[PDB]
Design a protein around this ligand. Sequence first.
Ligand SMILES: [Cl-]
Ligand SMILES: [Cl-]
Ligand SMILES: [Cl-]
Ligand SMILES: [Cl-]
Ligand SMILES: [Cl-]
Lengths: 224, 212
Amino acid sequence: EVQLQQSGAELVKPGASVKLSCTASGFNIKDTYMHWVKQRPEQGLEWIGRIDPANGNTKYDPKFQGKATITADTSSNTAYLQLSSLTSEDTAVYFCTRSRGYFGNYYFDYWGQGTTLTVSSASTKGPSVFPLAPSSKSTSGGTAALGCLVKDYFPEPVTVSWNSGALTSGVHTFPAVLQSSGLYSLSSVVTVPSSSLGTQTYICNVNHKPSNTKVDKRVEPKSC
Amino acid sequence: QIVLTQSPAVMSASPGERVTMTCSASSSVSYMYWYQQKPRSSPKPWIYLTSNLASGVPARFSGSGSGTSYSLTISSMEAEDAATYYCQQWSSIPLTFGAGTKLELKRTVAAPSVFIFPPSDEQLKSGTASVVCLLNNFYPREAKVQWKVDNALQSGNSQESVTEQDSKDSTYSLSSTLTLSKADYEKHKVYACEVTHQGLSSPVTKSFNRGE
Ligand SMILES: [Cl-]
Ligand SMILES: [Cl-]
Ligand SMILES: [Cl-]
Ligand SMILES: [Cl-]
Ligand SMILES: [Cl-]
């Protein structure tokens, strides 16, 4: 079975270079064309370029000439994308994807899971986690909303689960917002039966891998 | 470079409706290709060589066109089809994609439920006070949140974000955070968020008094 395994998230200062990789399994990259595609936050797909690992021939969108360098190593079945003198315009998700050319009807038939690149010189910063406590002001129709405010972290992402993943229904984890301080904040809320507040413990599990921060926060009712 | 123009940028359909979207090329191409992408995941091959469905794509999808005009059709929309669809051409280098058609789910108007959360004592110890206003399960997406502190409007000290459409009920939810210093939080009494939405016959205000 065909898989394209891309390297992990990168946080890199402006002006530096970065190398992203895509390791293929279930086929030989020499039989294909290995492409890279960029997607900026909230934007569409842009083709960067490709390499034919059988002969090393590359093609690039002229927009990316000098910015992007694509290489491939057939002995490790890996394709690479190197980006130079990074700017904020390079912050994006990068996908690797294969094409089989004419004999495989051209289309991008398998895609990697994407690598997120954040271009910033700032240090990582783990979030503070604060309860959003259920109360008479968060109850409707015999149910109560409660949550966690995950404040002031950098870079993205955080993940939030509830009761270690056992609680999934009625959860809304909101998109992160960028604050005027340049740090992110997000909230995650869950709606539960009001009757359960005195009898069911609710814990939000917050993970911020870039800072190695894991926080479990028990959210308790507030009698105002 | 061949420019691919996708119309509409955004559209919405009920389950069971026929959906068509178009892709227009700045000059002629031999075949058109399409990819489906959902938030936070990789694009998937959907249609290749204009009309061939990729593996796993259900039979309600089809593709058509020639020359400079191509289209993707869903004979009968399902909730799981809500996604962004990109067209893409292989006839000329550089390869180019359309800007996408975002297909959303149409449903009836739904008013938000509005909840408010004071700052935690934990956060207050740190010198900051975030007040959170939640608007749950509304439709359509457009909603206005207005923060008032002792009945004075608040400008430039809040942030808000809206979930993706919920695929169970096709609604949106919105979270807005007002952030003040602890000093300014402790100097005022009444904290209120006022919500305007097309589902509400008049705006709804939820509020609390600090320390009570
Ligand atoms: Cl890695
Ligand atoms: Cl940016
Ligand atoms: Cl760091
Ligand atoms: Cl995040
Ligand atoms: Cl994926």
